[PDB]
Structure formats: C-alpha cells, structure tokens
Amino acid sequence: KFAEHLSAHITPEWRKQYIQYEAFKDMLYSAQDQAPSVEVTDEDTVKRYFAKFEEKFFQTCEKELAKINTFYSEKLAEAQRRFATLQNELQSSLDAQKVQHRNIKDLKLAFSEFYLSLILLQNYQNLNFTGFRKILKKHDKILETSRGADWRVAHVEVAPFYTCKKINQLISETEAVVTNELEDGDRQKAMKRLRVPPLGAAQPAPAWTTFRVGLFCGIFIVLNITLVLAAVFKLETDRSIWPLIRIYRGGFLLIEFLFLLGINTYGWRQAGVNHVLIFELNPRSNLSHQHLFEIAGFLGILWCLSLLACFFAPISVIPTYVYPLALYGFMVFFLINPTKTFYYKSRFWLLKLLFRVFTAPFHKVGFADFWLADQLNSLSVILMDLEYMICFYSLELKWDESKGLLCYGVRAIVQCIPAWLRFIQCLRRYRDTKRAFPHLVNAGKYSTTFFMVTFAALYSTHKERGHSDTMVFFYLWIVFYIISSCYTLIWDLKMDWGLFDKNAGENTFLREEIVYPQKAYYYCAIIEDVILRFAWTIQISITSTTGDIIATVFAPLEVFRRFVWNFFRLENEHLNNCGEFRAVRDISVA
Amino acid sequence: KFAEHLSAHITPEWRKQYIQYEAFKDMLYSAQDQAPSVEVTDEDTVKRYFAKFEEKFFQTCEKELAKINTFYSEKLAEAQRRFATLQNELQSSLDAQKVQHRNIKDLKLAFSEFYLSLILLQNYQNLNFTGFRKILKKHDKILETSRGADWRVAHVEVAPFYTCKKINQLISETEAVVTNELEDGDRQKAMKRLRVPPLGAAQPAPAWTTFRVGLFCGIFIVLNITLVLAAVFKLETDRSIWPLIRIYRGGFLLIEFLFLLGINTYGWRQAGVNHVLIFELNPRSNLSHQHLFEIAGFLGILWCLSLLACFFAPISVIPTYVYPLALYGFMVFFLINPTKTFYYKSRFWLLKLLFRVFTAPFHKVGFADFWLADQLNSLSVILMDLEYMICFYSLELKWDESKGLLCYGVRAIVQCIPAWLRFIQCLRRYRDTKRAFPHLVNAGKYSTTFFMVTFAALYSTHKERGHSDTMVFFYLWIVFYIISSCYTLIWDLKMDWGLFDKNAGENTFLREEIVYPQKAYYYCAIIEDVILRFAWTIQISITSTTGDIIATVFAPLEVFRRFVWNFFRLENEHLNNCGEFRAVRDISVA
Ligand SMILES: O=P(O)(O)O[C@@H]1[C@@H](OP(=O)(O)O)[C@H](OP(=O)(O)OP(=O)(O)O)[C@H](OP(=O)(O)O)[C@H](OP(=O)(O)OP(=O)(O)O)[C@@H]1OP(=O)(O)O
Ligand SMILES: O=P(O)(O)O[C@@H]1[C@@H](OP(=O)(O)O)[C@H](OP(=O)(O)OP(=O)(O)O)[C@H](OP(=O)(O)O)[C@H](OP(=O)(O)OP(=O)(O)O)[C@@H]1OP(=O)(O)O
Ligand SMILES: O=P(O)(O)O[C@H]1[C@@H](OP(=O)(O)O)[C@H](OP(=O)(O)OP(=O)(O)O)[C@@H](OP(=O)(O)O)[C@H](OP(=O)(O)OP(=O)(O)O)[C@@H]1OP(=O)(O)O
Ligand SMILES: O=P(O)(O)O[C@H]1[C@@H](OP(=O)(O)O)[C@H](OP(=O)(O)OP(=O)(O)O)[C@@H](OP(=O)(O)O)[C@H](OP(=O)(O)OP(=O)(O)O)[C@@H]1OP(=O)(O)O
C-alpha cells in the first residue's frame, strides 16, 4: 500500500527530504524480531528492549520531523520570495502596453510554472502527514502501545508543516491574479492552464494506449515472421539485394531508435531521473513510454509492409521501386502533418527542435538540442542512405522497366554532417559562456571525427589509384583512429556519464551516488560502451573508404550504444539538478 | 471530475438513493442561464429570481438529505439485525464441534459477505458527503454567495449519516470476531479475506492485461488476413474443403462466443447491470472484460495457426489430419489444466458449472447453470461437430496415407442434448418450487424443439425412401415449426427480456424502466431476435434432415442472437434484483 505509494508519488529531486518510510518500517520490523525473549528471560528485562528501542524510535522520529518543517519553511520562503518578483514583473508589464504578445506569453509560463512549485509543495505537506500517521500506526500496532498515537497529537499537528495554512492561501491569490491579469476574467481558461494533473509515475497509461501498443507490436511480430520466411523462400533469385537493404536500412535504424527511446523514457520515469525538467517540457502533458512504443510500432508496421510488397510484389501495375518510396514518403509525411491530429504538439515540438539543431550555430543551445545532436551521431547511416537512395532514383533507376531496385564528395561530407553539427554547437556554447573546459574540449571530440574520415578517404583514394602517397596516409588514419577512439571513450565515461570520480567511496569505480537500482548495470555498460565505441569509428571509416555488409550489421548496433548511453547522460544530468532541489523550471519574462 | 466519479463509484442497486448530482448541476446551470437580466430590469427584481431559486434549491436539498439518512438508517438497521443472527449462528456452531469443515467454510462466506455490506454502506456515507460539499461549492460559486457553505454546517454534518460513527465500530467488531473465531488469531489471514478491493467500474484494467489484449488481437488480425489470402491462393485444388470447415467450425463458434461474451461482460459492467451479484461470483475478484477478450484472442491464435498449418502444410512428417486434432486437444487441455496457473480459479469454477449442468436433474439450479444452459442452445453446432469430427477420425480417416482430411441416431439426438438439458432443468425448478407459470411452461419451450427435430427427421427418412408416410410428416414438421418459433419468440420477449409490459408508460412498447443508455437498442434487438429466431429453427431442421453450406453460415449468426440476448436476460434480471436494494449475496450456514 504506502511504501510503494510513497516511493512513486514522491518528487524525485526531493527524495532526501521525505519521511524515509522504508527505513522506519525496517527498523520496526527488525526491532520486533530481535525481541529478547517471549517470556524466557525476566519480565522487566523484556521491557528494557521494548523501552530502549521506544526511546530510540521517538528520537529518530524527532529528528525526522525536524527535517521536514525546516526543509518545508525554507521551500515556502522561496515561494514567497517568488510571488514577490513574479508579481512586480507583471506590474511593470501591465502599464507598459500603454513583443508584448511575446512578453505576455512568456509571463503565463512564469505563473503556470510557479503554481507548479506550490502544488508540488502542498503535496509535500500531505504526502508526509499521511505518511507520518501510517508509520506511527504500525508502531502502535507492533509494540501494541498508544504512545505513538499520542505523540502524533503531541508534535505532528502542532508543527509548522501541517498547521501552516499559507501555501493554500498562496494558491488562492495566484489563481485570482492570473484570472484577473492574464485571461480577462474567464476563470475557466485560467484553471485549465494552472491545474496540475497527477504526474510522475502516478499516471497510468490510458488503457487505450496500452492496447494500441499491444496491437502495433502484434501485427509487427507476425509481419517479421513473414519477412523471415519469405526472404528464405519468395525473394530467392540472382538479383542483388544490396539495393534492397541499402534502402530498407534507414527505416530500420529509425524504428530501432524509437523502440529503444521508449525503453529509455521508461527507464527514466521509473528510476526517478526526470526527463521532464531537463528537456524543458511542460510537466502536465508528456509522452510517457507507451506513446513512443506506439509510434515506433506504427512506423514498424509501415516498414514491414513496404518490404513485403517489395518481395511479394503484390500489384503488377506499380513497379517495385515505388514501395520504398511510399514507405519513406509516409515516414516523413507523418512528421510534417499540418493538421492538429496524430501527436500535433509532439511533432511540432520535435520540428522546432530539428530546426534549432540542423541550423545550429545561431540559436541558443538548450539541452534538447544538445541531446538530439548526439542522437544524430548514431543514426548517421540514415543520412548516407538518404543520400544513396536519393542519388539512385535520380541517376541509376530504370524508369523504362517495371523491375527496378533488384550512387568525389558526397559520402565523405555527409558522413560528417552530424559531427559538424555538434562541433558547432560546442563552439557556440564556448562563444557564449566563455569557458573552455568543458566547451572548447568536447569540441575536439568531433574535430577528430573530422581527421578520421578525411584521412581514411585520402588513404582510400590513394590506394584505388595505388600511388606512393598511400601508406603514409594510412599511417595517419591509423594514428588518428586511436585518437578519435580514446578521446571519445574517456569523454564517454568521465564528463558525460560522470563515472570514475574521486568521491566514489563505497561505489567501486563509480560515482558517489547512483540513481539506478542495481550496481551491475554500470559495469555492464562501462564494458559495452568500450567495445561498441571501437566498432563505431571503424564503422565510420569503412563506410567512407573505397563495406555495406559490415555497415548493415554495425549500424543496428551503434544505435544500441546510443540507447545504453542515454540512461547515463540523463542520470548524470538529473543528479546534478538534484543537489539544488529544483522541481520547476526557472522561466524568464522579458 | 465528480459527476463521472459518482456515476462510476456508485453501487448500482442503490442509484435511486445517491445525491443525484446531475440533476443538481443541471438545475444550477439552467438557473444561472435563465437569469432575468444583467442590469436591464430593476435591481431587486433580479434578486427575486436569484431568491426564488435559492428558496427552491435549499428546499430540494432538504428533501435530498431527508432521503439519505432515512435510507441510511434503514440500511444500518439491516446490518445491526444481521450482526445479530450472523453471530449466534457462529455461537451455536462453535460449541458443536465438541460437515464441520463445510459448516465452518460456509460461515466464512457469511462474514466476508457481511463485511461487504458495511463497507459498501460506509462508502455511502462518504460518497454522499463528499458529493454533498461539491454540489454546494458550485452553488456558492455560481450565485457567488455563502448561504450554501453555511447550510452545509447547518444541516449536513449534524445529520445522522455523516456524524453516525456506528458502521466503523461494526467494522471493528466483525474483524476481531472473524480473527478470533475463524482463523485462530492470525489477523493477516483474516484481513485478506475481509478486505474489499475498489470494485465496480472503478478498477482499471491491469495495464499488462490491456497490453496482452492488444497483442492477441494483433497477431490475430494478420493471421486472419493470411488465411483470407491463402485460401484464395495456396488451398486451391480439387480436394473437398467440406471436411476442413466441418472441423474448423467448432473452434470458430467457440471463439466468436468468447469475444462476444467479452463484449457482454463490458456492456454489463458499464451499464450498471451487475454480473457479479447474479452469478454468485465473489465481488472482490472477477473477470473484467479484458480477460475474456484475452482468452478469446488466445484460442483464436491457436485456431488460426492450426488452420494455416493445414493449408500451408508446414512439416511433411506430420500428416495433415494432425493439426485440427492438436488445436482441439489444446482448446480442451487449457480447460482441464490441473496446475494453479493460467486462470486457475476461473476454469475451476467453469468446470464445477459444467458438471452441475451436463448432469443437471440432480443438482440445484442456480442462475449460473440456468444461464450456461442457454449458451448451449446456441453453440449446438459444436456438438454435432464433436460428433462428426470424432466419428470421422474413427471410421473414415485413412491412416495409411499422409494426406488426410481433404459420419441412424447420433445426429438427431446430439442436436437435442442441450434442449434436453434445459427441459430437465426447468422440470427440476418445478419439482422444487411447486410453481408452474413459469416453470412447467418454459419447459414446453424445449418440448417443441423435440417435436421439430423428430418430425423433420421422420419426413427426411420417409422422403429418402420416398414412401407414402412422407407428406403427412412434412405437414407435421411445418405445423410444429411455427409452434416452436412463436412459442419461443413470445417467450424471448415477454418473460426473459420482460419487454411489452402494461406498465410501459412513456417507454413505448418497452418496460417501465430501461437500464441501457439509448432507446433504439431495444427496438433494433426486438427486430433482430425476431429475424434470427426463425433462422435458428430452420438451422436446426436442415442440419438434421437428409445443408452444411447453410449450417456454417447460420451457426456463426445464431451465436450473435445469443450475444444480443445476454444483454437483456441479464438486465431484466438485475432490474428485479434492484427493487429490493440487494448489494450482497444472502449466504446460508448449515
Ligand atoms: O500554449 P501553446 O503555445 O503550446 O499553444 C496554444 C497557444 O499557441 P501559440 O501561442 O499561438 O503558439 C495559443 O494559440 P493562439 O493562437 O490561440 O493564441 P496566442 O498565440 O497564444 O495569442 C492558445 O490560445 P490562447 O490560449 O492563447 O487563447 C492555443 O490556441 P488554440 O489551439 O487555437 O486554442 P484556444 O486558445 O482557441 O482554445 C494554442 O494551443 P492549445 O494550448 O493546445 O489550445
Ligand atoms: O476460498 P476458495 O475455496 O475459493 O479457495 C481457497 C480454499 O479452497 P478449498 O476450501 O480447499 O476449496 C482454501 O483451500 P485449502 O485446502 O488450503 O483450505 P480449506 O479447504 O479452505 O480448509 C484456501 O486455503 P485456506 O485459506 O482455507 O487455508 C486456499 O488454498 P491454499 O492456496 O492452499 O491456501 P493458503 O495456504 O494460501 O491459505 C484456496 O485458494 P486461495 O484462497 O486462492 O488460496
Ligand atoms: O489489517 P492488515 O494487517 O491486513 O493491513 C494493514 C492495514 O492497516 P491497519 O491494519 O488497518 O492499521 C493497511 O491500511 P488500510 O488499508 O486499513 O488503511 P487505513 O490506514 O485504515 O486508512 C496498511 O496499509 P497502509 O495504508 O497503512 O500503508 C497495510 O500495510 P501494507 O500495505 O501491508 O504495508 P505498508 O505499505 O503500509 O508498509 C497493513 O498491513 P501490514 O503491513 O501487514 O500491517
Ligand atoms: O476551477 P474550474 O472552474 O476550472 O474547475 C472547477 C473545479 O472546482 P473549483 O473551481 O475549484 O470550485 C473542479 O473541482 P476541484 O478540482 O477544484 O476540486 P475541489 O472540490 O476543489 O477539491 C470541479 O470538479 P468537482 O467540483 O466536481 O470535483 C470542476 O467541475 P467539473 O470538472 O465539470 O465537474 P462536475 O461539475 O461535473 O462535477 C469545476 O469546473 P466547472 O464545472 O467547469 O465549473
């Protein structure tokens, strides 16, 4: 009932302030078990044990409450100190109208993001009180006394965290001020923006969505079995399937990315590392994991069906080079669907992000656009494809005949588009912050992947012609390979993940604190990301030299290191947004 | 928020006693809209309108509360009157031990079924109070006054339904009496049987189960598309598919039965007609609709795959006459799985039911075994199959050759096994109750389906030989056809469904009350069950004369009338278990 209820309804950034139910329960249960004797020893000696612990208990309760109200009052002062500046800012603004649209618009994200601190603090008044009357009721049950219940009336509801009705009156003035100065009355349009819906792991998946995740993962399994059958029967021929996989690798890397990003969003929501505060999403509406599994499953059904139509060749009139085109025209029409349907706010946010990353020297660099520029250094085969598959229909495809599928620059550069993106983003972080370690470095990390592709291509072109200036360039590519491997594997474990810290202490080789449940995950991953970081630099070289057989088998694997890396790049982030207790974004009105 | 919360957490049998939130809200909203004028008319005249309604409101509130405590106290007295007899019964029992196992066992279903009346009445104290402070808070919000909030302290929490702390002390004595005299202490094994889990429409489907319902309905859709393809391609031949469908019709009628029974359980749970009190299930643990959709989907995957293995003929060693056998050996092994896994209590209850119906002159006739003896008068083709498919492997199958499928009594009687079952059950109802209308009649209903099969078979056998005694028997089958059609279509609308009642009133041609939301469902069904009750008597005759082409197309359709009939046979039941307010079973200890 509660221990779970409390370990779920808790605000992650504050976990070191709640009642610590588990320790209490364990203390009580251990105490009862280590009872001296039922009647074997003397009577009053049994009392001692059932006394000494009683003294210990109410003592640790005392310091326990002492934490709450101290933490509580401190948090409250913050709110008070907020409703101060957050109000005069409106005051100045109000008269100023006689960018104002913008100024008004950002202001409502100040209050809406204020009224989420309070109503996340109000919970802290209840989630403790009715987490303070439960634990006591076992103490009065286990020992079968009443001292606990009495102490509950002796200290708890006299203490300034349950009998301090200040937060509620703050809630009342914010909702009459927002109502009055933001929505021209119309309280209904104000308590639609302000209301906070039960968030965290406390929102179950809307049954229909778990169903649809069941369906699109259902059609998908049979479609995969049908592919594995038919590619071991129907396809059989003398025709080259290398165009077929060289075109159906893009969709696959992009499906294996969204299933894994779904598992990422779940492994974040459950383990407490909030992927809401960091990305700057709005904490009332999100995409829980199920929606990601569902989008991934859907695009997976589309991918499977296009492949099957290519192999089974279902209708004679449509040549065969139209199924891949239809599939990839849908996988990108779904993303620019200009209605307000099928994840409208979602795709619109993602599009704003892409536009602030695919042209990102100019715009600021948040965390969303520093993250989805390290999801493009792994799906970097979906770009050499959307180069190959675009050159191929243009200059190689035979439009005279219905049988289709069964393309000096472009590859070398297009392989380093995302590395260039991130190099520029880090230079921009520098040119604003004025701090080198860590912005100028962490811009080298990508300068190397420039001095790998270039030198590998030089060796390639000078071995194709087979000239004297070839072995020299190869000695250069091989000496820059170890560079662009270590200088990105040390950075993958020291500053991103944050592991290997002197404050490690008990956590052998790890960080001082670890958010994720077990202690073998970190070691498994610290081995994996070491293996799979050498077969991504090769994977870069080979698919740039003068190959696809190793590409289509290392591409689906790189995305796995990106998945196992998201866990820790978001942990090591949250657990730097935890030491300062920050449950709500600081929004700025200008 | 509440109107729904209240229209869901409500105890169906008591719906005519709750606060009637919707009428209140509508009254308030209409009142505010029909306000005389904002300032157009005179000031104090606006007061009149905002006064007259104020007087009206508190008046209808007054009679509203007057209903609750009167209903409440009356319900409480019942509980008190219970804890009386329900206790001395234990008292007498206690000393008697010095069938006792049985006597003890039935006694715990007396308390567990008692402590569900209280904790369904306790809710009635909260679900009203915090349904009495909401409605008022809109009245004080809409009119923007405080009279409502004051009246709340003037009448509500002085009234003997919120300040009557008697039910809770009853809960305390029942759980210390059960703890002490049923479980030898061991409070943990008593508050495992007594606890009531949030029931009704208030229990969401356990996410994993909605997922699995998504999966087994996912593999199923592609498997059906593959069947429709392959039976329009792979099967093609000169071999007779009549054995193939004459064997794969059983599984289909049994799948189309469980999907539809799932839709039945949902249409019951949602529309309020409880399928829990009537079947005598235990109200804490049930099978919500999702579990039925999931079992149906699973047996559907098995059916589809067996069919596909028959058509695709996947492995050469296993002849082809082994796939239907494997499918139907699994569909019946799933039902006698002697572990405690895969719906253990469920299948064990269903098996106890079958054993109390397939031999049912002797056992009592509850409602479960009167209901699942009218689910066997529709799945009556699954018996002429398990006759045909059993005779065929025995005396027709060619075990010498691997190619298999591509069998004077038995049919005539086996068609009337379930009609015989129900005829006997009604005779047993008579031989106990001693009442004819409705037991002796409603035993005729099945005597006719005896004088239809018999006479149709007589005409058949005398036309095969083609003798003089043929046209006479046909004039008899045709005169008993209209009998066995009208005498079961009038009974399908007058006593089962209960429709066409003189107390109809406003509900044209219907019953006085209707539990189901709309008013076109009843007419649609009253037309349907008229059409599909003539093509079930034919369907009986044809598949008994000397055919399958019309059988395999009317069998999947009869089950539809059984589905559309379950709705109303359970409505017309619940809405006779509602007039007496009975939310808990009366269990008897002997
Ligand atoms: O909050 P965002 O930015 O994520 O999205 C909302 C915001 O968009 P935007 O500011 O234009 O980027 C407003 O748009 P807008 O043009 O109407 O007005 P402004 O541009 O804000 O002046 C808002 O209206 P409003 O609340 O300001 O009146 C609402 O409009 P719409 O859908 O038509 O819904 P209604 O408002 O008509 O019900 C938008 O969507 P939703 O929130 O889902 O409804
Ligand atoms: O209540 P039912 O009839 O629907 O089912 C229970 C009841 O069955 P039955 O009376 O035999 O028909 C008891 O069986 P039983 O033989 O143990 O004892 P009795 O025959 O009742 O004397 C009960 O144990 P118990 O609670 O009485 O000790 C429990 O057994 P089991 O798991 O071994 O129980 P635990 O060891 O986990 O308690 C059965 O299932 P569950 O309730 O799901 O567990
Ligand atoms: O009577 P029992 O022994 O069968 O059950 C206990 C009962 O409290 P009771 O006995 O009435 O005082 C539950 O509260 P309840 O629903 O009555 O609610 P109210 O308090 O009455 O509102 C309580 O949940 P909780 O809500 O306090 O957390 C539960 O804790 P459980 O979830 O198992 O474990 P935790 O998560 O608590 O550690 C207790 O079981 P045990 O832990 O074994 O003692
Ligand atoms: O602030 P607003 O005006 O946007 O919203 C109102 C708000 O009460 P508030 O304003 O504080 O007085 C809700 O209660 P809440 O969460 O505050 O709960 P507390 O009681 O405060 O704990 C109330 O639900 P609820 O009162 O039935 O639980 C809701 O009615 P709606 O959902 O339609 O539910 P019904 O009308 O169908 O019942 C009201 O909206 P409108 O009906 O449009 O006026």
From Swiss-Prot, chains A, B:
Mutation effect (Q539A): Decreases phosphate efflux
Outcome (variant: R246A): Decreases phosphate efflux
CDD domains referenced in this protein's UniProt entry, alphabetically: SPX_XPR1_like (cd14477)
Effect of R195E: Increases phosphate efflux
Phenotype when changing G214F: Monomeric; decreases phosphate efflux
Documented activity regulation: Allosterically activated by inositol hexakisphosphate (Ins6P).
Location(s) in or outside the cell: Cell membrane
InterPro entries documented for this protein: EXS_C, SPX_dom
Effect upon mutating F581A: Increases phosphate efflux
Resulting phenotype, R569A: Increases phosphate efflux
Residues the entry annotates as binding phosphate: D374, N377, K445, Y446, R533, R561, R562
Cytoplasmic face of the membrane: 1-204, 273-285, 360-364, 435, 498-516
Site (Gating residue for phosphate transport): W536
Extracellular-facing ranges: 236-240, 314-319, 399-405, 467-469
Outcome when changing L121P: In IBGC6; dominant negative; phosphate efflux is impaired; loss of localization to the plasma membrane
Protein name listed in UniProt: Solute carrier family 53 member 1
Gene source species: Homo sapiens (Human)
Taxonomic classification: Eukaryota, Metazoa, Chordata, Craniata, Vertebrata
Gene giving rise to this polypeptide: XPR1
